[PDB]
Design a protein around this ligand. Structure first.
Ligand SMILES: NC(=O)C1=CN([C@@H]2O[C@H](COP(=O)(O)OP(=O)(O)OC[C@H]3O[C@@H](n4cnc5c(N)ncnc54)[C@H](OP(=O)(O)O)[C@@H]3O)[C@@H](O)[C@H]2O)C=CC1
Ligand SMILES: NC(=O)C1=CN([C@@H]2O[C@H](COP(=O)(O)OP(=O)(O)OC[C@H]3O[C@@H](n4cnc5c(N)ncnc54)[C@H](OP(=O)(O)O)[C@@H]3O)[C@@H](O)[C@H]2O)C=CC1
Ligand SMILES: CC1(C)N=C(N)N=C(N)N1OCC(=O)Nc1ccc(Cl)cc1
Ligand SMILES: CC1(C)N=C(N)N=C(N)N1OCC(=O)Nc1ccc(Cl)cc1
Lengths: 522, 528
């Protein structure tokens, strides 16, 4: 077939167009009033250059022998495509420029800028040329025709995670026809998140042996099947940061230790992982399922206030600590003399009054115990190279007084070149229900500390101790692993807020959260 | 020449031989004894030996057929060549060597004196002709000391697949001293345990759908002007190695990442460091004791410090009486005064590790006080949780008592240990807030690895993984030159730690209960 012989790839960038279900079709905005919808997105413009111009001559011979039996790249436009280009660069910095037009003759441009009559008249032009691969730069109509006539092999699709006004749309790529094989890292250019995905059309080596020898010792470990991680295992490149979470699910499903827990439900457990997310480039809110952030933002505001009063949350319908405050739960904890929803000296108490004698959840503790939250802020502002900037919730003395010991042991902060990174160490991690919320919680926290100290957020680093998947979560997580992440949203904090204690729920906005549908983890 | 055409490799296994000791690669030279191998079974070596000498790649032969047929002007199996003593050492049940074309060098023996499917040759020359007239993938020289010596001398070996057996045995025959101009190490395996010995595998080399490979180049359009440009020529050896699979490269490779990508900061003193934030190292304590080999470390001091922790001691005088100076400088009048501890006796280090491990929450008085049944005995508690509730996810030991930080001589570097139990095996995560890669971390790895052994043993479990999480990971700028020397040293197989096994209680350990066996190490380095 033609499209493997000649190497015809599309290359596009689609934004979003003016509750809401998402799918790949979400991204389709191509152009507007003859120009791109967006002002300038220089990373995608840079990606464009690299992909279209790149050449590898050592693999061209293998192309030259197959192509005949039937150096630079070919780039195909349409008139309104060729036109919209600002003058001062045409032809495009050393590529074989080419235009599909009806009312343009090849006379009135160069002899390098080969015009074509119809679509069928391009196969003519290639068999007579010396080029690497063929990139359809597109236009609405150009893409429509080249796709309709199964001419396109791979599709270099840039997903622009922001909404714009559009007069022209990329066609609904048929997912039984084509399918995503690679997803890139997520990036911020020009005040939008984006990523780079790849649709394919469906069907010394001294040291290569040395590799096999070194593997001479390697070991259905768990009852988890091959055919079920199909989409997941059928991607080549999985560089989207959400794969850091998803790959831990995979590792624990594939290689996890079978274990009883206190409940009895059954878990697969491993011990010791890292996740790093770049807060300067995205907000890591998992996209492979709907997540809600009001509760966990209220939880955080509750911590910062020093509250241990489970009821302040329940009245706002944030039920994160409901189970941990019942008579039945406190009694099983031997807390027979503790009022319902008095969670004892937990996070907020420890952050504001570590070392103070806990009484009940209504006492006045002003200026009692160590106000660690205040202390790490001053340190961040006054001593940013300090290696002593820890917020520790694990107070050994008070563990037995807490409804439960802190799942999140400590935050350590690091400062370089006006930038703040944070490590949270988590002793116990429910990968299915908990961890996705936990990533969002401390990322927001990392932003909040960043802002009130006049620093840019850099890296949130999540260290998992006991990392477990509930046996009764495995079906749901199987559905989830075979979803492909969307580009992440962004967090906008109200910039007026300059002390850690002044954030209200209103001061938090999530933007461009494009997500798969909800999953009952049960 | 002749070695590249015919792919003539050597494979051997060498132990240390009967002899304030210095170590080079000539340390590992012992090949056999009284006609046989110096050791009974080392199964993991024997299995490696079989995988390498029987592995062929069907698809790769075609190009080797071409290459070899070109030079002569013209199931798949490997050839294996052995001296007559070598051949006679093999038991009947395993002769001839399975799934391989056996060749034997001999003058005293001819075909008539063998029942078995084997080629006999009396000349090295005759082998090269034999190889010319045969279909094989790779030709491996199984040795005998004499066979090894002459195939080397004749510049015939492309690569030596070399097992370092990190134990000592009576030996009568030795591998030839390899000329380091002739052969350079290009690969070093993971370290392992088999039949009560560590070993690794190193490869010496001689000197003098391709559509989705393009997709890689694309997904890198946005990479590096790489921060601190320190010079290539400096890390020549470190960067030459193709496979760096020795667990010591986990430490070494962090030194490199900090040197090449580290952030420049001036610190607590007004000195100078390079820093990054957030690393993890994993060390399989069932397989080796990860005491670093690219320089000398003594453990006496750090074992004394750990026994001093477990006792709940805060008294620096106890360590100085044992001539352990690890805490001396944090105990001086000058230092306690600069930490505002004006009312603190010299060498009274206040409520640090030991105090927090046995008495967390008790009011610190002075280092002489009897704190019995005051504060939470964390160490006792976690020893009980590991014994009675092994799946508990709360087996943390914590030194970072927020309330007492200002009363300590300095806050703890080593913040906490979380424990994990599966199938009678104990693993340990240790979170380090502040890590001097240069002096501190080598010792810190040694301390918590010994601790995992101690807890594991007194709880009737087997040590599994020690996991080391680094927060602020930094290199002092005056350590840089010393660390360059170190990164160009090739690790040796790790030693082993023996705990006196009669110790059933965490408090009952003493110095003499600790034996490091087979520490093979490079030369002492002053980071200063
Ligand atoms: N999002 C993205 O990735 C990209 C978007 N754009 C945007 O695309 C928009 C323009 O695209 P859309 O309106 O389709 O414009 P096109 O670039 O598809 O141009 C259409 C013209 O191409 C010619 N043509 C198309 N098909 C044929 C054919 N089958 N035979 C002969 N000639 C043919 C005709 O030229 P004639 O006028 O001679 O009839 C036709 O009018 C602009 O807003 C531009 O900014 C451009 C590139 C990429
Ligand atoms: N640790 C390890 O990796 C290895 C250890 N070994 C051990 O080493 C010892 C055996 O080795 P070592 O005694 O050197 O003896 P070899 O196995 O090298 O035997 C040498 C004999 O083979 C013949 N031979 C060698 N070269 C030639 C030649 N060029 N032309 C004709 N014949 C030749 C001669 O046999 P003839 O006497 O018949 O003339 C010679 O006496 C054993 O203990 C064995 O277990 C062996 C291999 C590997
Ligand atoms: C569609 C293409 C090829 N791919 C990506 N990812 N982004 C685009 N903007 N591309 O448009 C085709 C084209 O002709 N682009 C173009 C627009 C403006 C200038 Cl200045 C140069 C090329
Ligand atoms: C030298 C060699 C091949 N390499 C390693 N790494 N370990 C060894 N023991 N080898 O021995 C050569 C040899 O003659 N081996 C041999 C093979 C089978 C038996 Cl049963 C006994 C010895």
């Amino acid at each position: 077939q033609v499209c493997d012989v000649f190497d015809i790839y599309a290359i596009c960038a689609c934004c979003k167009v003016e509750n809401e279900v998402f799918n790949n079709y979400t991204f389709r905005g191509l152009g507007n009033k003859g120009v791109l919808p967006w002002k300038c997105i220089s990373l995608d413009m840079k990606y464009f250059r690299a992909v279209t111009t790149y050449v590898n001559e050592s693999k061209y011979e293998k192309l030259k022998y197959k192509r005949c039996k039937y150096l630079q790249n070919v780039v195909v436009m349409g008139r309104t495509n060729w036109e919209s280009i600002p003058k001062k660069f045409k032809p495009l910095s050393n590529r074989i420029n080419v235009i599909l037009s009806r009312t343009l003759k090849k006379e009135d441009f160069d002899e390098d800028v080969y015009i074509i009559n119809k679509v069928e008249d391009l196969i003519v032009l290639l068999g007579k040329l010396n080029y690497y691969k063929c990139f359809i730069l597109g236009g609405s109509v150009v893409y429509q025709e080249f796709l309709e006539k199964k001419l396109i092999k791979k599709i270099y699709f840039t997903r622009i995670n922001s909404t714009y006004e559009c007069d022209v749309f990329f066609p609904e790529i048929n997912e039984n026809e084509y399918q995503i094989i690679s997803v890139s890292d997520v990036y911020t250019s020009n005040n939008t998140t984006l990523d780079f995905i790849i649709y394919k059309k469906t069907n010394d080596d001294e040291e290569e042996d040395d590799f096999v020898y070194f593997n001479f010792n390697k070991e259905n470990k768990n009852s988890i099947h091959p055919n079920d991680f199909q989409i997941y295992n059928s991607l080549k490149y999985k560089y989207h940061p959400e794969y850091q979470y998803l790959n831990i699910i995979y590792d624990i499903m594939m290689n996890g230790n079978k274990q009883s827990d206190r409940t009895g439900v059954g878990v697969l457990s491993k011990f010791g992982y890292i996740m790093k997310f770049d807060l300067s480039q995205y907000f890591p809110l998992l996209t492979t399922k709907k997540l809600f952030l009001r509760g966990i933002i209220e939880e955080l505001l509750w911590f910062i206030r020093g509250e241990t009063n489970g009821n302040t949350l329940l009245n706002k319908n944030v039920r994160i600590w409901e189970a941990n405050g019942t008579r039945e739960f406190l009694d099983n904890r031997k807390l027979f003399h503790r009022e319902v929803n008095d969670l004892g000296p937990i996070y907020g108490f420890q952050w504001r009054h570590f070392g103070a004698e806990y009484t009940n959840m209504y006492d006045n503790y002003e200026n009692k115990g160590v106000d660690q939250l205040k202390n790490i802020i001053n340190l961040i502002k006054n001593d940013p190279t300090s290696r002593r900037i820890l917020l520790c919730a694990w107070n050994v003395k008070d563990l037995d007084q807490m409804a439960l010991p802190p799942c999140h042991i400590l935050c350590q902060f690091y400062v370089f070149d006006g930038k703040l990174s944070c490590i949270m160490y988590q002793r116990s991690c429910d990968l299915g229900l908990g961890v996705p919320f936990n990533i969002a919680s401390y990322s927001i926290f990392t932003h909040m500390i960043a802002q009130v100290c006049n620093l840019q957020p850099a890296q949130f680093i999540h260290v998992l101790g006991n990392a477990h998947v509930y046996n009764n979560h495995i079906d749901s997580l199987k559905i989830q692993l075979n979803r492909i992440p969307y580009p992440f949203p962004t967090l906008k904090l109200n910039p007026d807020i300059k002390n850690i204690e002044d954030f209200t729920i209103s001061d938090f906005t999530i933007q461009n959260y494009v997500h798969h549908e909800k999953i009952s983890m049960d």
